[PDB]
Design a protein around this ligand. Structure first.
Ligand SMILES: C[n+]1cn([C@@H]2O[C@H](COP(=O)(O)OP(=O)(O)O)[C@@H](O)[C@H]2O)c2nc(N)[nH]c(=O)c21
Length: 177
């Protein structure tokens, strides 16, 4: 078996139609933990790809003990890069995102906390979470390489978690790569 540098945990949360504004993530839960390339596949192969997910469901893959929540102390000062695409057109983007992450392919690897693919009504988004948004140099690098890894050519934005918390209005991208 080929061991990974870091352990990872798959997370999942299917609201089942319930609103996401009330008691958010009260059901988010871990699914599987893996620490080798082979184990990663065995899990990935027997797990619903993004395209098979119902509206409202969220699939996450975080490093070590980090949880898919803004309130997590590890992501307290972080943010995230997002890519949006049509319904059922994120299977590959998500896959490559996972491989690049577990592969420790990023120049500022420490920053990487995990990834989350969100399935919605008329769109699907894949987002990679980072530790320090105040570090513009690192984030710009993470963003560019991520697009490079997924061979994405459209501009993307980085949204600080503190701005995402804004329940009053949509968050404005801090950076764009
Ligand atoms: C990711 N996330 C989402 N929420 C809540 O869930 C809402 C919806 O978040 P979403 O479903 O990720 O975005 P969407 O509805 O545009 O598809 C957010 O506006 C917050 O009210 C969150 N609330 C907390 N406390 N922590 C989180 O990480 C978090």
């Amino acid at each position: 078996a080929h061991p990974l540098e870091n352990a990872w945990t798959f997370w999942f949360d299917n609201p089942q139609g319930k609103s996401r504004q009330v008691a958010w993530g009260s059901t988010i839960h871990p699914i599987h933990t893996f620490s080798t390339v082979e184990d990663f596949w065995g899990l990935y192969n027997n797990i619903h790809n993004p395209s098979k997910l119902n509206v409202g469901a969220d699939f996450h893959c975080f490093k070590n003990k980090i949880e898919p929540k803004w309130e997590d102390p590890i992501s307290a000062n972080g943010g995230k890069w997002t890519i949006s695409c049509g319904r059922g057109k994120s299977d590959t983007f998500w896959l490559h995102t996972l491989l690049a992450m577990i592969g420790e392919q990023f120049d500022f690897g420490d920053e990487i906390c995990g990834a989350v693919v969100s399935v919605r009504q008329k769109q699907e988004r894949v987002a990679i979470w980072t530790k320090n948004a105040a570090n513009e140099a690192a984030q710009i690098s993470i963003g560019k390489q991520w697009k490079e890894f997924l061979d994405y050519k459209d501009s993307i934005g980085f949204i600080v978690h503190e701005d995402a918390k804004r329940s009053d209005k949509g968050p404005k991208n801090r950076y764009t790569v």
